């Protein structure tokens, strides 16, 4: 069943017990934290042998 991703993530916030307006009021910051965290996985996997 399709749902907009910004709304999918709102019901995932609602599932951890954080009121869903916390996403919509911080959506740019939350997306920047996600995009920056995926960027650091490239570096970890590119650099580290173990």
């Amino acid at each position: 069943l399709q749902i907009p991703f910004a709304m999918q993530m709102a019901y995932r916030f609602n599932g951890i017990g954080v009121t869903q307006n916390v996403l919509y009021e911080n959506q740019k910051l939350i997306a920047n934290q996600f995009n920056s965290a995926i960027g650091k996985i490239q570096d970890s996997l590119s650099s580290t042998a173990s």
């Binding site: 709304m7 019901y11 009121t19 307006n21 009021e25």
Partner: protein, 56 residues
């Protein structure tokens, strides 16, 4: 409770796992802050069940 949806012209609150449309009210919704912050927001009247009885 769930999700805002529209059938083309009206707007309703509904539960996520079975379509059951309800009139949007000050009970089935909650306020937080001004309209300017939210990325994707729409203009529709929210019904307030106290006022039309109180002012009757």
């Amino acid at each position: 409770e769930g999700v805002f949806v529209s059938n083309g012209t009206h707007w309703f609150v509904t539960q996520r796992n079975f379509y059951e449309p309800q009139i949007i009210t000050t009970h089935n919704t909650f306020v937080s802050g001004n309209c300017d912050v939210v990325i994707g927001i729409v203009n529709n009247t929210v019904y307030d069940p106290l006022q039309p009885e109180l002012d009757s």
